């Protein structure tokens, strides 16, 4: 069975005071035995958050670059993320792709490097509103997934995150059936293009205005293996989402 | 009376162990009179480095974004940098412009936001080799400086860093005359387009393969007020650079 996975993406929010308070609340929460919980603090607070968080919660970086060290002012490497005690990185997030112009090619190189260095990868994919309305969701997500898959060095350390761009931060949550429909196809894509084992074992998580009010019906879909949560990860309802099953 | 300014840009280098060792070396440096030393660790280590560094060395972030909080996965704000005890940010670095595609317009918005929030800015400008060889160095650097200047909310908190792209990481250090020629022009640009006071008070530092072997002759040029140092900031030679006017 795939272990239920809940990530909280704090994005560019927080200071030591308010994040420290949130962390205290999370450390007091009961993480089910069948759930893996990950928090992704702003980059300046990776180390702080790992120090403050109970080990039952993992830490993720929000991004990384594609070499171990080098002349890349403003970047961090998987080796740094590991050195700070974090065990995952979020790659290909919508904001990186669409605000900061990260290409699929660049995301694939980051995936290859992070996995080669033994860091877990939450690899994000998803279509824009205009693509959804044109009926080409599948084409877009399959193309993104192929680039990720072609660079996966260790499938045991990947989580795929389907996050339709029109659902991020907009309050426009995907319906359960909408999410299940895409997750099912993605899983079929993995079966046909990689292996049965990889299709069976890879967590495909949904993100997009996931909230306490929407999480249970989404989590009950058989191909929805958890969530990546943005706005609600900073809120007490993040605990309800952790317990969505 | 401009204070000599030496910044060290660690770029994407270091782990807690080797940066702890580098920090020990920096903490043992006697900072001369009237000299300001700033170090810019990788973003994951801003807090670590500020905790470990003696207050005689300031910490900078290597980059930031242009709002206080928001939905910008992978970014950090001036408020976070201040919260970690850092007092500067490097903006418009060549690597950000030319590897990561940051436009002048974006850099100007970052400069405005950081300064509005009381964070010091090391604002980088510089021409590429093909621009220099085309004879357009001045046009390029003046255009970059104008975008910075148009967004400066507090000149007391800005340092301008002239870093010709062909000199960064290449070993191809500008000659003293090459640097002084551009710095003199930039200073003239400030005089003509801002004020005499701003021209007189603004540090214009040089970067581009600054090393212990080149730093004194560069620092002696009258419009070269210090350095932004990449590769040599990771070595004990950085201390020789701090003492370039000694």
PDB file of C-alpha atoms in Angstrom, chain B residues 4-165:
ATOM      1  CA  UNK B   4      36.460  51.175   2.365  1.00  0.00           C
ATOM      2  CA  UNK B   5      33.994  48.311   1.754  1.00  0.00           C
ATOM      3  CA  UNK B   6      34.911  44.653   1.266  1.00  0.00           C
ATOM      4  CA  UNK B   7      32.195  42.100   0.564  1.00  0.00           C
ATOM      5  CA  UNK B   8      32.689  38.363   0.280  1.00  0.00           C
ATOM      6  CA  UNK B   9      30.190  36.460  -1.896  1.00  0.00           C
ATOM      7  CA  UNK B  10      30.423  32.777  -0.940  1.00  0.00           C
ATOM      8  CA  UNK B  11      27.973  31.954  -3.805  1.00  0.00           C
ATOM      9  CA  UNK B  12      26.750  28.347  -3.748  1.00  0.00           C
ATOM     10  CA  UNK B  13      29.607  26.960  -1.656  1.00  0.00           C
ATOM     11  CA  UNK B  14      30.004  25.511   1.765  1.00  0.00           C
ATOM     12  CA  UNK B  15      28.565  23.288   4.455  1.00  0.00           C
ATOM     13  CA  UNK B  16      28.408  23.811   8.207  1.00  0.00           C
ATOM     14  CA  UNK B  17      31.877  22.265   8.756  1.00  0.00           C
ATOM     15  CA  UNK B  18      33.894  24.101   6.145  1.00  0.00           C
ATOM     16  CA  UNK B  19      32.009  27.366   6.556  1.00  0.00           C
ATOM     17  CA  UNK B  20      32.533  27.094  10.359  1.00  0.00           C
ATOM     18  CA  UNK B  21      36.287  26.941   9.602  1.00  0.00           C
ATOM     19  CA  UNK B  22      36.102  29.897   7.249  1.00  0.00           C
ATOM     20  CA  UNK B  23      34.200  31.842   9.898  1.00  0.00           C
ATOM     21  CA  UNK B  24      36.885  31.153  12.473  1.00  0.00           C
ATOM     22  CA  UNK B  25      39.436  32.653  10.056  1.00  0.00           C
ATOM     23  CA  UNK B  26      37.203  35.731   9.583  1.00  0.00           C
ATOM     24  CA  UNK B  27      36.558  36.172  13.311  1.00  0.00           C
ATOM     25  CA  UNK B  28      40.345  36.339  13.813  1.00  0.00           C
ATOM     26  CA  UNK B  29      40.774  39.133  11.248  1.00  0.00           C
ATOM     27  CA  UNK B  30      41.635  42.539  12.672  1.00  0.00           C
ATOM     28  CA  UNK B  31      39.329  44.880  10.729  1.00  0.00           C
ATOM     29  CA  UNK B  32      41.192  48.071  10.010  1.00  0.00           C
ATOM     30  CA  UNK B  33      39.931  51.558  10.815  1.00  0.00           C
ATOM     31  CA  UNK B  34      37.246  52.955   8.630  1.00  0.00           C
ATOM     32  CA  UNK B  35      36.618  49.627   6.841  1.00  0.00           C
ATOM     33  CA  UNK B  36      33.339  47.787   6.457  1.00  0.00           C
ATOM     34  CA  UNK B  37      33.368  43.979   5.889  1.00  0.00           C
ATOM     35  CA  UNK B  38      30.307  42.040   4.726  1.00  0.00           C
ATOM     36  CA  UNK B  39      29.934  38.299   4.001  1.00  0.00           C
ATOM     37  CA  UNK B  40      27.156  36.709   1.896  1.00  0.00           C
ATOM     38  CA  UNK B  41      26.612  33.012   2.736  1.00  0.00           C
ATOM     39  CA  UNK B  42      24.399  30.700   0.771  1.00  0.00           C
ATOM     40  CA  UNK B  43      20.771  31.274   1.707  1.00  0.00           C
ATOM     41  CA  UNK B  44      20.453  28.152   3.816  1.00  0.00           C
ATOM     42  CA  UNK B  45      23.323  29.396   6.022  1.00  0.00           C
ATOM     43  CA  UNK B  46      22.438  33.094   6.602  1.00  0.00           C
ATOM     44  CA  UNK B  47      21.234  32.357  10.114  1.00  0.00           C
ATOM     45  CA  UNK B  48      24.105  29.909  10.881  1.00  0.00           C
ATOM     46  CA  UNK B  49      26.710  32.361   9.658  1.00  0.00           C
ATOM     47  CA  UNK B  50      25.263  35.312  11.604  1.00  0.00           C
ATOM     48  CA  UNK B  51      25.246  33.206  14.755  1.00  0.00           C
ATOM     49  CA  UNK B  52      28.864  32.203  14.292  1.00  0.00           C
ATOM     50  CA  UNK B  53      30.340  35.424  12.956  1.00  0.00           C
ATOM     51  CA  UNK B  54      31.590  38.172  15.275  1.00  0.00           C
ATOM     52  CA  UNK B  55      29.488  41.359  14.960  1.00  0.00           C
ATOM     53  CA  UNK B  56      32.482  43.122  13.390  1.00  0.00           C
ATOM     54  CA  UNK B  57      31.498  41.308  10.159  1.00  0.00           C
ATOM     55  CA  UNK B  58      28.053  41.971   8.705  1.00  0.00           C
ATOM     56  CA  UNK B  59      25.996  39.358   6.902  1.00  0.00           C
ATOM     57  CA  UNK B  60      24.319  39.724   3.549  1.00  0.00           C
ATOM     58  CA  UNK B  61      21.837  37.596   1.716  1.00  0.00           C
ATOM     59  CA  UNK B  62      22.760  36.729  -1.896  1.00  0.00           C
ATOM     60  CA  UNK B  63      19.345  37.652  -3.266  1.00  0.00           C
ATOM     61  CA  UNK B  64      15.777  38.448  -2.227  1.00  0.00           C
ATOM     62  CA  UNK B  65      12.358  39.041  -3.681  1.00  0.00           C
ATOM     63  CA  UNK B  66      10.187  42.179  -3.884  1.00  0.00           C
ATOM     64  CA  UNK B  67       7.349  41.725  -1.367  1.00  0.00           C
ATOM     65  CA  UNK B  68       7.188  41.123   2.349  1.00  0.00           C
ATOM     66  CA  UNK B  69       5.378  37.732   2.217  1.00  0.00           C
ATOM     67  CA  UNK B  70       3.660  35.828  -0.468  1.00  0.00           C
ATOM     68  CA  UNK B  71       3.179  32.877  -2.750  1.00  0.00           C
ATOM     69  CA  UNK B  72       6.761  32.695  -4.116  1.00  0.00           C
ATOM     70  CA  UNK B  73       8.053  29.205  -3.458  1.00  0.00           C
ATOM     71  CA  UNK B  74      11.851  29.310  -3.291  1.00  0.00           C
ATOM     72  CA  UNK B  75      12.190  32.990  -2.500  1.00  0.00           C
ATOM     73  CA  UNK B  76      13.006  34.972   0.645  1.00  0.00           C
ATOM     74  CA  UNK B  77      12.058  38.560   1.650  1.00  0.00           C
ATOM     75  CA  UNK B  78      14.008  41.354   3.211  1.00  0.00           C
ATOM     76  CA  UNK B  79      11.944  40.814   6.360  1.00  0.00           C
ATOM     77  CA  UNK B  80      13.310  37.297   6.639  1.00  0.00           C
ATOM     78  CA  UNK B  81      16.881  38.459   5.993  1.00  0.00           C
ATOM     79  CA  UNK B  82      16.548  41.082   8.775  1.00  0.00           C
ATOM     80  CA  UNK B  83      14.962  38.463  11.051  1.00  0.00           C
ATOM     81  CA  UNK B  84      18.083  36.306  10.588  1.00  0.00           C
ATOM     82  CA  UNK B  85      20.235  39.289  11.623  1.00  0.00           C
ATOM     83  CA  UNK B  86      21.588  40.088   8.187  1.00  0.00           C
ATOM     84  CA  UNK B  87      21.763  43.768   7.223  1.00  0.00           C
ATOM     85  CA  UNK B  88      22.480  43.678   3.462  1.00  0.00           C
ATOM     86  CA  UNK B  89      21.355  41.981   0.285  1.00  0.00           C
ATOM     87  CA  UNK B  90      23.270  41.525  -2.973  1.00  0.00           C
ATOM     88  CA  UNK B  91      20.961  42.435  -5.895  1.00  0.00           C
ATOM     89  CA  UNK B  92      21.494  42.226  -9.646  1.00  0.00           C
ATOM     90  CA  UNK B  93      24.454  39.892  -9.453  1.00  0.00           C
ATOM     91  CA  UNK B  94      25.682  38.717 -12.860  1.00  0.00           C
ATOM     92  CA  UNK B  95      24.728  35.166 -12.072  1.00  0.00           C
ATOM     93  CA  UNK B  96      21.169  36.245 -11.285  1.00  0.00           C
ATOM     94  CA  UNK B  97      20.949  38.365 -14.455  1.00  0.00           C
ATOM     95  CA  UNK B  98      22.621  35.998 -16.868  1.00  0.00           C
ATOM     96  CA  UNK B  99      22.093  32.476 -15.574  1.00  0.00           C
ATOM     97  CA  UNK B 100      18.682  33.012 -13.939  1.00  0.00           C
ATOM     98  CA  UNK B 101      17.310  35.686 -16.265  1.00  0.00           C
ATOM     99  CA  UNK B 102      16.524  38.460 -13.786  1.00  0.00           C
ATOM    100  CA  UNK B 103      15.656  41.600 -15.696  1.00  0.00           C
ATOM    101  CA  UNK B 104      16.636  45.159 -14.896  1.00  0.00           C
ATOM    102  CA  UNK B 105      12.975  45.828 -14.126  1.00  0.00           C
ATOM    103  CA  UNK B 106      12.889  43.054 -11.560  1.00  0.00           C
ATOM    104  CA  UNK B 107      16.175  44.157  -9.990  1.00  0.00           C
ATOM    105  CA  UNK B 108      14.824  47.738  -9.674  1.00  0.00           C
ATOM    106  CA  UNK B 109      11.713  46.456  -7.871  1.00  0.00           C
ATOM    107  CA  UNK B 110      13.877  44.451  -5.507  1.00  0.00           C
ATOM    108  CA  UNK B 111      16.075  47.454  -4.804  1.00  0.00           C
ATOM    109  CA  UNK B 112      12.995  49.599  -4.030  1.00  0.00           C
ATOM    110  CA  UNK B 113      11.517  46.961  -1.713  1.00  0.00           C
ATOM    111  CA  UNK B 114      14.697  46.125   0.149  1.00  0.00           C
ATOM    112  CA  UNK B 115      15.532  49.754   0.756  1.00  0.00           C
ATOM    113  CA  UNK B 116      11.958  50.595   1.747  1.00  0.00           C
ATOM    114  CA  UNK B 117      12.362  47.841   4.377  1.00  0.00           C
ATOM    115  CA  UNK B 118      15.628  49.224   5.718  1.00  0.00           C
ATOM    116  CA  UNK B 119      17.914  46.583   4.313  1.00  0.00           C
ATOM    117  CA  UNK B 120      21.259  47.669   2.760  1.00  0.00           C
ATOM    118  CA  UNK B 121      21.759  46.874  -0.896  1.00  0.00           C
ATOM    119  CA  UNK B 122      24.932  45.920  -2.798  1.00  0.00           C
ATOM    120  CA  UNK B 123      23.645  46.628  -6.298  1.00  0.00           C
ATOM    121  CA  UNK B 124      25.670  45.021  -9.080  1.00  0.00           C
ATOM    122  CA  UNK B 125      26.160  46.302 -12.590  1.00  0.00           C
ATOM    123  CA  UNK B 126      28.516  45.389 -15.402  1.00  0.00           C
ATOM    124  CA  UNK B 127      28.951  44.789 -19.131  1.00  0.00           C
ATOM    125  CA  UNK B 128      29.569  41.577 -20.999  1.00  0.00           C
ATOM    126  CA  UNK B 129      32.689  40.992 -23.114  1.00  0.00           C
ATOM    127  CA  UNK B 130      30.740  41.490 -26.353  1.00  0.00           C
ATOM    128  CA  UNK B 131      29.406  44.824 -25.095  1.00  0.00           C
ATOM    129  CA  UNK B 132      32.851  46.025 -24.061  1.00  0.00           C
ATOM    130  CA  UNK B 133      34.265  45.029 -27.469  1.00  0.00           C
ATOM    131  CA  UNK B 134      31.356  46.755 -29.250  1.00  0.00           C
ATOM    132  CA  UNK B 135      32.320  50.021 -27.472  1.00  0.00           C
ATOM    133  CA  UNK B 136      29.057  50.195 -25.438  1.00  0.00           C
ATOM    134  CA  UNK B 137      30.315  49.642 -21.877  1.00  0.00           C
ATOM    135  CA  UNK B 138      29.119  53.099 -20.765  1.00  0.00           C
ATOM    136  CA  UNK B 139      25.696  52.753 -22.289  1.00  0.00           C
ATOM    137  CA  UNK B 140      25.167  49.341 -20.581  1.00  0.00           C
ATOM    138  CA  UNK B 141      26.389  50.412 -17.119  1.00  0.00           C
ATOM    139  CA  UNK B 142      24.628  53.733 -17.201  1.00  0.00           C
ATOM    140  CA  UNK B 143      21.361  52.028 -18.143  1.00  0.00           C
ATOM    141  CA  UNK B 144      21.766  49.541 -15.275  1.00  0.00           C
ATOM    142  CA  UNK B 145      22.725  52.315 -12.825  1.00  0.00           C
ATOM    143  CA  UNK B 146      19.741  54.415 -13.837  1.00  0.00           C
ATOM    144  CA  UNK B 147      17.327  51.557 -13.123  1.00  0.00           C
ATOM    145  CA  UNK B 148      18.974  51.178  -9.644  1.00  0.00           C
ATOM    146  CA  UNK B 149      19.027  54.907  -8.994  1.00  0.00           C
ATOM    147  CA  UNK B 150      15.375  55.332  -9.974  1.00  0.00           C
ATOM    148  CA  UNK B 151      14.544  52.903  -7.161  1.00  0.00           C
ATOM    149  CA  UNK B 152      16.879  54.048  -4.452  1.00  0.00           C
ATOM    150  CA  UNK B 153      14.925  55.098  -1.411  1.00  0.00           C
ATOM    151  CA  UNK B 154      18.014  55.676   0.758  1.00  0.00           C
ATOM    152  CA  UNK B 155      21.464  56.257  -0.755  1.00  0.00           C
ATOM    153  CA  UNK B 156      23.086  55.875   2.652  1.00  0.00           C
ATOM    154  CA  UNK B 157      22.195  52.200   2.391  1.00  0.00           C
ATOM    155  CA  UNK B 158      23.474  51.505  -1.138  1.00  0.00           C
ATOM    156  CA  UNK B 159      26.816  50.302  -2.430  1.00  0.00           C
ATOM    157  CA  UNK B 160      27.281  50.108  -6.183  1.00  0.00           C
ATOM    158  CA  UNK B 161      29.352  47.135  -7.354  1.00  0.00           C
ATOM    159  CA  UNK B 162      30.903  47.331 -10.834  1.00  0.00           C
ATOM    160  CA  UNK B 163      31.583  43.731 -11.855  1.00  0.00           C
ATOM    161  CA  UNK B 164      32.425  43.333 -15.504  1.00  0.00           C
ATOM    162  CA  UNK B 165      31.014  40.028 -16.543  1.00  0.00           C
TER     163      UNK B 165
END
